[PDB]
A paper describes a structure:
S. tuberosum phosphorylase is the first starch phosphorylase discovered3−5 and has served as a model SP for biochemical studies of plant phosphorylases. The most significant structural difference between the Pho1 and Pho2 forms is a 78-residue-long peptide insertion in the middle of Pho1, termed the L78 segment. The stPho1ΔL78 structure reveals that activation of the enzyme occurs through the proteolytic degradation of the L78 segment and the association of the two remaining protein segments to form the active enzyme.
In P3121, there is one stPho1ΔL78 molecule in the asymmetric unit, whereas in C2, there are three. stPho1ΔL78 structures from the two different crystal forms are almost identical, and since the structure from the crystal that belonged to P3121 was resolved at higher resolution (2.2 Å), we focused our analysis to this structure. stPho1 is composed by 916 residues. The two segments are held together by 27 intersegment hydrogen bonds and 288 van der Waals interactions. The essential cofactor, pyridoxal phosphate (PLP), is attached by a covalent Schiff base linkage to Lys762 in the C-terminal domain.
Numbering used by the authors:
A (entry chain A), B (entry chain A): 23 to 446, 511 to 916
Write the structure that this text describes.
């Protein structure tokens, strides 16, 4: 086991012997690389030890596939899970640095975007920590999505540079390479098997990122694919003639599959690039999974045993091509019959749904997919045809009307002709969501209410047919990254009041804080912990936003994707309201009527989403005006934090007092940031939707600020709008006027306010009900104000958040998947 | 100091902890990577120790710049120079491999092409070994020139894959990065300095390759530049719209500068790419050199002392832009006056010429260079104008005719107008060779005769003007790579007969073999050494060419660039002759009249050089026919070895009996393979040109087979041809007829024989005098036959080659450059 002495030598050894810099001096960037390489040594011993037990045991292994992982920085979670935090800190002191400054050099791995990606990242930590044999498979994106610049003009986008020097975590596996084919033609050989020939051939190379469990040796992989072409595909003859671009066409074509996350797909070229990404991920992974299955099998290879050895989870519909890809391999490559290969594929694959309404469910042009993946389209057509025969077999054809409904709704192919049928220019599509439901043995939503909606409204017919595939797995986040490592002072408190350090594993012990919520010593520690965390943030806000704020103010935080439906605009409108009120009062009245606040916004706008980009500019202009107004001073600051990512979350969430989750009611499946906020003793204000419902139930309805229309009323209120029956509240008109009056400078906001007016019209008519919800929202912010002035009641609420947060551990989620869907069991790594 | 035990641990440590493969098993590719990383640990300790002494001493340092380095494999020369060969061999045995199989995994560094590149590589070994503070600067070419495939159709070209997995030698210096500008505009600031703004900006990143000296710690760098663009230059907005190619234009543009060696430049785009390559190399290097000069200087920076601290050698005219680049930096960036910066530039820079006639001397379109490098063109124009004023100042203007001659010949700018002058549509060019002579303080040829030609015929006027710049530095090759490490059995012999291992440093002790050339014990060892080396080659010829040959045959070798002027066609024609004679004789007569031979060819043809490609196909067809003819059997084999490179040279040269250097007399400046052949006891047959002249003089005229027209007669014989006075010898017509008769299969050779006929016409008329030289060549091969049957006389000749080879050590060459041009001195690394 390393100690400070051996870690000291180890960093020095890497600094000199695995250098990435000049040999002079030991600057911070050099120190971070040497440190991380040192940690990797530890990760690799454990990774190899886990790898060896898994190989010999040949137990069932799970595989979690996703277009995104939001891994964050690795250093502090890795030394923490290894329990070497102390030793690395002391070793860095010896070499003249501190831990925190060295950790600051690490770029966030830009491998994901939002909650879908952080959920997968949480899950990997949970799997490793719980000794579950499972890996992650994703793509290695060179440039992420974008790094966000916050200028005078609002948001600007720049390519991420996280791999500009390389990652000291990843391990290239030069011998783990899989061929990926696109386009080409299918024919039949004299063996009666299909053979897919020609098109474009590329290679997918494996890059492992070791994921260490907490207090265990289990160290699993996140295996990422990077796409390339052998150097032999460089066309010399072209290059030498002066056609430099034609010479590299094959490499250009291969490499771009892994440039960015979710490449813009309004164009044909963008759509093709998206299918290529999904297919690469499904093909490379399954090829890798099958190859490991054959290797562990030895001579005793029973293809029958494949689903007893392999689970594959599809995170959303992006991994959908797994179903026809596994079918392809079994049938075309392994020689299985259709029936055998379908039974196998079904008992292998499971689908998790993450969306609310049947309109974000992905669909592909038939012609497009047929050009790119001819063999996959044959297989899907056959799956569709069996489905048709199965639907006719139940239900019969006495209802014709009932049969037609079922066939129309449930078929994978849209706007197609039936095989055989009875009665005596729309574009042909492939419904990925239909495929996923048909092709696996489990389908789960991601919250109680959500999973009920999936059974009742997304796939009702599928549930009437196969009620037994449908399940719920409520999301969760890891308390390692999201309490133990991001919030040390609160961790020290939890350990004291619960009696042990055991809570990080047995997170149910957070419940033992409830009996102390009114205890005055607990409360005092609780407040000093919160204040200390906010002091760290004050320094951070100074360097990142340029504004100096005080820690004796409520930190009111709204961090998430910028979208009209997320309702940043509501929050900022509320802010503008209070600022208007402040300005029409004396100094003395201002202090009696409003508690001091720092309102922190962060999150990225999709770059061609004009309105979202306009909301960002808006927040920055409201902040320029408020934060410089000498009548206001430290009563109110509005700051927009550039480039929100896991590292910024880990800073902000420990420090937060109030966090806002105020999307239009009914449009969130779950959300997970609210769960991290609760764990850290933040109090949530929000609408009754998504994860807010479950949080509110666990933390108690007195420790949550609720407001707004509920899901069941959205329909009616939008009808009111359309008929002209909607009466905007005057305070709402006040803010509107105030913005047009130009109080926020010279920028013209007409286009923005216009989105809130009219009664119909594509992007007008206040579709997300900002104006409606506004009175109950501003009202509820006054309840907050009142609660915050009662420091004792506020602390009690803050503690009960942390106390009622245990069920939101991704350890709970992962045990559920492990028992109810994947049927994997813990494996000990001695 | 490492031993077998610590090297064992070290390989294991890297195998597990700096992995590039899967963790299963220890296959050869894994073993080579772990081994090389282990060696690098040793190279790095010494490199850092050398770096530290150089930094503190701040003595004068030399810099050798070249478009090519032909580094070969590094492993065996590195463990040899470190003296760990034994320890690494034993360590590999312990882990179940042998040294020779592990060394076979290493790709040759594809960083060069021909002798110009191997000379630089020899020089780096010599500098390090002699404790001279000097570095190499070159480009890091990803795909080399091409990897040569030898098929049924002759030569095919494929991109080199040497960097497909990465190099375990190189060290990326992420903090050593220099901006390179192209295009743009020049203006004047209010300080009166020129400012070069706009165009295209890229970055050149440093990759060090440590070069260890023999039996010393001095370990120097070959620092290679690789070109790139910050990830910020990736155009997201384009990428997201579907314009994937436009999005990466800047990276595509930057990266291609380092794809291949000598990109085809018939097109504008190819020419631009060549200037970009040269400029990148001169700019990045000088920026690095100057930055190190300022850093070592501290606060005491005297720009006056720069040429007392820095020598820059230009290997040929490709580094020519160094002259205006240094001028640019001093003037525009450092604020020096013109005069000061010109004095400095002159005492810094030196030019080595490598070509014979004033027609391969490089020239650039004025307009082209002006578009790409506007500021450099201003500076060159000013240098030209001073030259003009200087020429007028000597010579005066009484001869007008004499003055005009001088001005026309010597000016850097061709087809330009004079500033001022007196008398009362050709494209404007920049003569790089004129620039190089004007801009440095030394000019050297590369052999006695050559350097005399440079003074008398290439730059006569420059020599009449500045006789003192002109010098000679006869080339040499290193006896580490080219005796001690490629030919172990011969090394054991040299050590025994000379009394010590000291010959590897004091290579003059090879002369002590002369007194033993007739000694029968020396001769017996000598023969067993040669035979043993040929046994290694027999195995190699089996796997690479597919032909099985016997070691009891003279190995007759011709390895070099395939070119009409190199005269492979003569050799193969001689072979075809003897084969024709063999076939018209009985078995018994065949054995009396011809000694058994294995005729080995190798070398690359420029890909669009139709004739050269046709000569390769020819040799392969002659070999298919001879090698399969049951009348011939092991009397004669003709094999073409694919992909000749340093690794193939190191195999073939130790094994060789006769090597052929038979270019048209007068067209070689030097050549260096002939010197390596001599060192290994090969006997040369050749024309009286280049290095052959000097070899023949040292080894003795009885130990060299000479034939052919001499340089002074080429002119006359080509005139004979043109006037119709040339009478082809009948034996030459025999071979011609025999080829057309289709004895070499179905390929049509008309186009090839046609190059030998007619009296004029671009590519006919036997310009390189194959037909002329043919009788004396076939005659001289019979003298060889006769000498080879007298094993005693043959051995005596073989030994006197090795005995008379010392002066061809690049250690001799490097001491000469060090004292006579660069004025650097040895620095001890304790």
């Amino acid at each position: 086991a390393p100690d400070a002495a051996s870690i000291t030598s180890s960093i020095k050894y890497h600094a000199e012997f695995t250098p990435v810099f000049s040999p002079e001096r030991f600057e911070l960037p050099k120190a971070f690389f040497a440190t991380a390489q040192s940690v990797r040594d530890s990760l690799l011993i454990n990774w190899n030890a886990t790898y060896d037990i898994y190989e010999k045991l040949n137990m069932k292994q799970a595989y979690y596939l996703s277009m995104e992982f939001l891994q964050g920085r690795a250093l502090l979670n890795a030394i923490g899970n290894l329990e070497l935090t102390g030793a690395f800190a002391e070793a860095l002191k010896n070499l003249g640095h501190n831990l925190e400054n060295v950790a600051s050099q690490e770029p966030d791995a830009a491998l994901g975007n939002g909650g879908l990606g952080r959920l997968a990242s949480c899950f990997l930590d949970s799997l490793a920590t719980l000794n579950y044999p499972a890996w992650g498979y994703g793509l290695r994106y060179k440039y992420g999505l974008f790094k966000q610049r916050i200028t005078k003009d609002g948001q600007e986008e720049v390519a991420e540079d996280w791999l500009e020097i390389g990652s000291p975590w990843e391990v290239v596996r030069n011998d783990v390479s899989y061929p990926i084919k696109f386009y080409g033609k299918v024919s039949t050989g004299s063996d009666g098997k299909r053979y897919w020939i020609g098109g474009e051939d590329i290679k997918a190379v494996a890059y492992d990122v070791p994921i260490p469990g907490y207090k265990t040796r289990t160290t699993i992989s996140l295996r990422l694919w990077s796409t390339q072409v052998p150097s032999a595909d460089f066309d010399l003859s072209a290059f030498n003639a002066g056609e430099h671009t034609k010479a590299c066409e094959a490499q250009a074509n291969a490499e771009k599959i892994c440039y960015i996350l979710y490449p813009g797909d309004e164009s044909e070229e963008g759509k093709i690039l998206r299918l290529k990404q999904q297919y690469t991920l499904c093909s490379a992974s399954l090829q890798d999974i099958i190859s490991r299955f054959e290797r562990r099998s030895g001579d005793r290879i029973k293809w029958e045993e494949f689903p007893e050895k392999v689970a594959v989870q599809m995170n959303d519909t992006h991994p959908t091509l797994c179903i026809p890809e596994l079918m392809r391999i079994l049938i075309d490559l392994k020689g299985l019959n259709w029936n055998e290969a379908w039974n196998i594929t079904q008992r292998t694959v499971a689908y998790t749904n993450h969306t609310v309404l049947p309109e974000a469910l992905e669909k592909w042009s038939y012609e497009l997919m047929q050009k790119l993946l001819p063999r996959h389209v044959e297989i899907i057509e056959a799956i569709d045809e069996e489905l048709v025969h199965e639907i006719v077999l139940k239900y019969g054809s006495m209802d014709l009307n009932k049969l037609e409904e079922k066939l129309t709704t449930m078929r994978i192919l849209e706007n197609f002709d039936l095989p055989s049928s009875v009665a005596e220019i729309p574009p042909k599509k492939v419904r990925m969501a239909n495929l996923c439901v048909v092709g696996g043995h489990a389908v789960n939503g991601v919250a109680e209410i959500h999973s009920e909606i999936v059974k009742e409204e997304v796939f009702n017919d599928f549930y009437e047919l196969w009620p037994e595939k449908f399940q719920n797995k409520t999301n969760g986040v890891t308390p390692r990254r999201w309490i133990r490592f991001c919030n040390p002072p609160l961790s020290a408190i939890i350990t004291k009041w619960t009696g042990t350090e055991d809570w990080v594993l047995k997170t149910e012990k957070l419940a033992e804080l409830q009996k102390f919520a009114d205890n005055e010593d607990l409360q005092n520690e609780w407040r000093e912990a919160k204040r200390s965390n906010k002091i760290k943030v004050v320094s951070f806000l100074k360097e990142k936003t340029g504004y100096s704020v005080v820690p004796d103010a409520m930190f009111d935080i709204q961090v998430k994707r910028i979208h009209e439906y997320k309702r940043q605009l509501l929050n900022i409108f509320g802010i503008v309201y209070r600022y208007k009120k402040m300005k029409e009062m004396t100094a003395a009245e201002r202090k009696t009527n409003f508690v001091p606040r720092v309102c922190i916004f962060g999150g990225k706008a999709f770059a061609t989403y004009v309105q979202a980009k306009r909301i960002v500019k808006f927040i920055t202009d409201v902040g320029a005006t408020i934060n410089h107004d000498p009548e206001i001073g430290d009563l109110l600051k509005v700051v927009f934090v550039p480039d929100y990512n896991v590292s910024v979350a880990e800073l902000l969430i420990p420090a937060s007092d109030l966090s806002e989750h105020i999307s239009t009611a009914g449009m969130e499946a779950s959300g997970t940031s609210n769960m991290k906020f609760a764990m850290n003793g933040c109090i949530q204000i929000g609408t009754l939707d998504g994860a807010n419902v479950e949080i509110r139930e666990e933390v108690g309805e007195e420790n949550f600020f609720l407001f707004g229309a509920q899901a069941h009323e959205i329909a009616g209120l939008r009808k009111e709008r359309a008929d002209g029956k909607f009466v905007p509240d005057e305070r709402f008109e006040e803010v509107k006027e105030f913005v047009r009056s130009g109080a926020f400078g010279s920028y013209n906001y007409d286009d923005l306010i216009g989105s809130l007016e009219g009664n119909e019209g594509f992007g007008r008519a206040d579709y997300f009900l900002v104006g409606k919800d506004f009175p109950s929202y501003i009202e509820c912010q006054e309840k907050v104000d009142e609660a915050y002035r009662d420091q004792k009641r506020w602390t009690t609420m803050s503690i009960l958040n942390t106390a009622g947060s245990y069920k939101f551990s991704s350890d709970r989620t992962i045990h559920e998947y492990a028992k109810d869907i994947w049927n994997i069991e813990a494996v000990e790594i001695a």
